[model samples]
Target: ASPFRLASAGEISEVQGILRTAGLLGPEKRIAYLGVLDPARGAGSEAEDRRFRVFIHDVSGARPQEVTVSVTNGTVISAVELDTAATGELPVLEEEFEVVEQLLATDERWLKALAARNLDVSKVRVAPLSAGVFEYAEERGRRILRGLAFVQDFPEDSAWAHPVDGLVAYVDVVSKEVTRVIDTGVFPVPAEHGNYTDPELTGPLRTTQKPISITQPEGPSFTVTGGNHIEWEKWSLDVGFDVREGVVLHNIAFRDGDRLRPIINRASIAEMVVPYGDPSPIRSWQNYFDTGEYLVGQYANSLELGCDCLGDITYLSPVISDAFGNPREIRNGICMHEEDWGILAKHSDLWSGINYTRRNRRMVISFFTTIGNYDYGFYWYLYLDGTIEFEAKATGVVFTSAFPEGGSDNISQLAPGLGAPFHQHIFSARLDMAIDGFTNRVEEEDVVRQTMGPGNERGNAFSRKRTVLTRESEAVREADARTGRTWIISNPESKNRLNEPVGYKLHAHNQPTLLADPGSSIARRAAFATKDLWVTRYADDERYPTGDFVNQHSGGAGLPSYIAQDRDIDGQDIVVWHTFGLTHFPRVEDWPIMPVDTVGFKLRPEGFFDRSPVLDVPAN
Candidate 1:
């Protein structure tokens, strides 16, 4: 099937070739960005069934202009210098990152500075210091890219143990020069030789193996049409990747035997923050927006069959261009397959003395991203029972703290001198409701033990209290573990056979209470982390809950800013921002690499069908 527009590898190659012919390749001219150009938007005109937008930067740093290039399969080619506003959504190029890494490795001044600080220049790793709404550094009127460093523990212990904290390196990308440096002082490496690396130091490391191999000799249950549009028995959606959000899904729909119903317009991770507890240079000022600061999409690791996912998996490669556009295919970035989920429903025929059971099969689309010491796996599943599950799995090494003075830590102590500080990983997702139609209403429901008098005289009584939300300002809700509450989004006009509105319920997992104080800078930048659910009137541009660009802006861009409009939301199209998270105090069990700590949310169909939609399947 001819699918919707997607940038092809051939097309990417063609554009780069054109730039070379135009004398835009090599030194003095570097590719800055390249990705699929939206034909439907005013971005570009589609030709030969594809389109791409490319950006080139002046390597000489004489000009800080982004050269925009347009691509088409036909004649009448075009290229132009873009207004900065046109590229605000564009991220800093990955190639620019390579420049900084190289400069750190070879720069003499940078080496000398590290040596003076008693740090091993060769053992440090760095991450881009995001220049959020301002210039982090000025090197001859050009913005210099900064990288935060973590020293490696060499010759004993493990790479997971050593940390040369409180230091940041700045580099002028144009000249490949280390422009500036900051050393907050090291916190001592508590290797003691037993930091999960040495076998003899810790005696024998505890080990276990649970091998799982999924085989589908017959074939995969789902089918992929038009490369990305996937379909199972009664569901379908288009999957892709975005530069900011790791995975992007579009137009998800479900089938009711004969007709297809749109469930959502779009869905993706909006923003995430991993704030460390230490109040020193290493962490006090650290409130990381992983998606915005570091670029989560670029951290995507290419997956391998049987290791990342099992069964007859279908893989899709995402193309990312450097400078303006170079189509680099990141293979195995996504995997899709169907697997058994145990039971659908159960009942017994008393008179006939007979019973029946059918195994449940659900489609899963998933991938993983590594932001340095942590690895996050995000998964989306569509069930045969009309339930959708969203999950975030956190694993990988713990970003440990080295205590020059060792003692007992209230939370976790890796060893005598090793300390694993407290931290939090907060995640938020965007869910666009298209349940039957665009116009949907949200109602907050709380299951609370009643304090009423009439029934209290007899015994225990509870109440399911519900309140309809009429404006965006009224939708910020924090989960009450004692009361048990949820938000239900429903289409008022669409009703089931029993005359109840057909809808979907957002069931978010319980999140640890945010320990960040409201007056703190960390809390200001991440106010959404404190709330579990936020409902706002739908706006094409209001994507991230924490502002459209999360880089370095203080707290004005997120949910607090969006809802301040106090827009009416009753029975209108709406967007749901669901935030969930886990607080890690640290433990020895979580040291080497954390076991996958997972949390999720569910959008379950409620009163959306006349009866069981899967009852049509043969019970044989």
Candidate 2:
């Protein structure tokens, strides 16, 4: 039979009909042209504007060619023989055609059937005639090719796998058919499990919910509640509480870390004392002792006489409690060392502790811990009768805010246009608290009879109280970019030396103010426009009195000073902004997948009340 006779045969027509039935061509067209030699041949000289390029390869000839066609008249524009010997990069069409042919070769049956359809196979030359057709229509372009379909099948016992790995096939938009199939089973890869070894590795650093729960029967018990949970990270706490004929009990537990260990023991607690201080040029240890005396006395007085319904009760330590009722204590006062204390003192005016004490009733409990020579610790406090507070202010080498956008730029310069002339930016004092009163209840067995007065009979009179808490003040300062001057303009009579850099030391003192009710309007407006200021002072300590020295005069004093809040001195605003929300910790089976950190605090009444008024009422 002649080759032309065989081409017109029904079997040949059926395969070609499948291509058209697959939506690979226009509905009315009998045959879709596969390749064009020149696109401009029928464009009547305007073909140049409508010409586009494509690539064609003939497997039988084992050769490729570049062909340009005209879209306006669907005719050849130009054709160039490809230099096969030169090994030039293959065009997109040739590459796509090769990919289609490779996909079809995987199915032996499909290949055998195609071979059978062409009798006298050698002369018929059915050598996988795959071609890529690229067409630019009204607004979009498409690429398509002829090939057998491929699919991926999974067994019933297949484990959990990523969604991306289970893809069955890749569809071609223009051809409206599955062009490439992926057999995931042939090359399977195991899925990866999440890491659950360390809580710190996967858990949030901070939370605002109770870390542990407690039950009470009769009296009262104190517990630390708010903390950031890091699976493997250790948390230290130096908490203080006043138990009125009751026991100050704490139980800690945690989900992650090397293993929960009790860092605080009832035997290790020597005595809990409150400190007092006067803003003076003294080392932190000395200042701590001074301030601590006052703190202890305040608590003692409240327990004995319920006198001075002011100041918040606080704890001092590093690692707090774990989830398993483990105890950790603050070895030293928070910011008690010379270096740490100096940072607190130098920036005292800008911190809330100073501001709150200046106008409100405030009390602070302090503690510490030594990680070698350096102290890593925190303080908890009770302010007024309703605001529990916690503070983590580090002291050591003073860090000043920078000026440019590169580093911790000084807040004062952040928006120069807003307060350029004044050069002032308000600093922040951060205090976080986790109140246990909100979650766990005091056990009845631990309850103790409250004496009405110093010598009152215990049975005739009864008094019950909870801890009230609040943060005194926390702030940053706006220092002169050139000269380090630290002071609050609002407190004109404040004794802190302005424009003078002091060495690393903690200055603590309580200067009782006669202005009992300063009124919110006056107090708020006083520091309304204040900025966080920095100052570098000379010191005898190795840490302070940095090797670099600059001689500058401020207020007629030639003090050894340098730019305190510059990028050079690590002087930049450290942001501690946060969003508060709830967090859940899943069961161990949820292992390798623990929940985020959750923390919160409570404001309970101390000796200020005769009964647990808040306990009786639902917490708001």
Candidate 3:
């Protein structure tokens, strides 16, 4: 019997209705489900399976929800929500006609004169890549791929630029000319503003903002505080601040003590190389084999070992900085001067290296962390992979609330307002590679043996291995009921474990609330209630550290945080994702063009195979 089965039409419709009633579907929303079944084993038995996945889409909101359901009696097993932040303003298809009419009217005279001058009207109609270009494509593949036109000018470019005038008019790939222009009047649905105007419209988008900043300092300084508390047996590496007073702190409470030092050391290396360090010289060297170029290699080793816990790490730090330094470290404790404010370190260990043995493969690493003011937590894991993977998962939670106990004043005043709320988010990354050796490729029988060795092998054996790479992904999710959308702002330049540029803005806008029609008043009240969500100012600056101690000196790394508007997503009118990640401090002598540094990862082939057994090749 097959373990998989399909849902009957009736069953599908019933599930759709349930999702729609739960505000998971709408007219503009698209939903689909695919059933996954396990094959039946016994003969003459009907195949029965129990896994199903339902995909719900609200392209306008960019928040697609996937619900995993069981086929046996249709129960939701798990919900996985993915962040799809829209890049450009939502194109208003209904208003396209008006834009077309206006284009014809405005350009009629000029177009007529050009036509009279013998210019080909057919060629002059409009550029091929014009507004609604997708509509004009004769093939489905062309239209689907045209959406990727944005890739041409990605990283530092905007998808809205091709359209011209914020209104996609005309784009002619051949002529390289844009003819039409129309402004899609769609503005970000404000969930909250300065004040509530109408219960129907105006509201703030973000009710909370993580408080933090980046500041420039004088010289290089490194400080490490003592291990404060141990969680899950992992000794936490407290704090390390720079001379410019930029703070970079790390804490590994959820991981094993043996791994904490290596993790911190890797973060320190990242701080040294990224932004200011040049990595080109060491590109040819392999991480595991090349100990001479140990800076980045050691960092890669730390990442491979530290990230042994994939889903249990927690991180809390600032998005912005007060200085030029890049601070990267595990964090713990309250700000040096601020009593109500604090920061924590957390991570979500997504993937780890796997070492293959005779009959099994073992996952060698996984990690996670979390950070917040007055509250924090961490999770870590170590799993052994065989026919089945064995996982060790653990979590730690820390909270500090010093207020009227239950009154409004009890909550810290340092938090953000309804327009912006404080939030703690975790990001992760992974990389894999294959390695081969030349010496192992030669045939043993072809070589001459100087000494008579009966038991010694004669030929070289070909082998392949897997290398694991890691990185970081960061973002903050916020929503306002008044505007009926959610905003996921993130850092565009944040590095992964491999230290590669994880390009693309991290902001995913216009996420609709779980409730279909959360009343405007209720949304506004929610925003107001969470107005004090964040605890610091210019927190998203990306140039300042969270605490004075962390940012007290130079060469001290600033805590990783969202830097607001430091580097905006180019061409878009609205600022979405900010540039966050490692940066370096500059001196007066380092003017004009800055020197480069070596950063990124090198992986050893470890998880590429099912076993490490020796094999014999077939003779030709």
TM-scores of all predicted structures: 0.84, 0.15, 0.19
Residue 177, candidate 2: C-alpha displacement in angstroms: 99
Across residues 1-620, which tens digit of lDDT does each residue of candidate 2 receive?
A: 21111011232233233333433223222211121112211214442333333334343333444544443345555566655323221312222334544444444443444344321212211111112111212211223333322121222211111111111233232343445443322211223322334454457655675543222233222333442111111223332232110111122122122534221111011111111121111111111110111112111211211121112222222322111112233232222110001111122455456631122222334333321111212334433223334343222111111122242222222121110001111111211111111111111111235556667755476443322111112222222323222121111111123422111111111112111123321121112112221222112221111111000000111111222222211121111111111111122332232222222222232221233212322111
> Least accurate stretch of 10 residues (summed lDDT) in model 2?
548-557
Decoy 3 TM-score against native: 0.19
lDDT of 2 at 30: 22
- Runs of candidate 2 exceeding 4 Å displacement: 1-235, 238-530, 533-620
For candidate 1, give the lDDT. 0.71
Across 266-360, the per-residue lDDT of candidate 1 in tens digits comes to: 78888888876776554455556788656677778898987788788888877765554456777888888888888787778899898977778
lDDT tens digits, residue span 516-576, model 3: 1233221221121112111111221232222111100111123322223232222111112
What's the true lDDT of residue 72 in model 2? 37
- Higher-scoring candidate on TM-score, 1 or 2: 1
Per-residue error for 372 in candidate 1, Å, reads 1.8
**Cα-based lDDT for every prediction:** 0.71, 0.23, 0.24
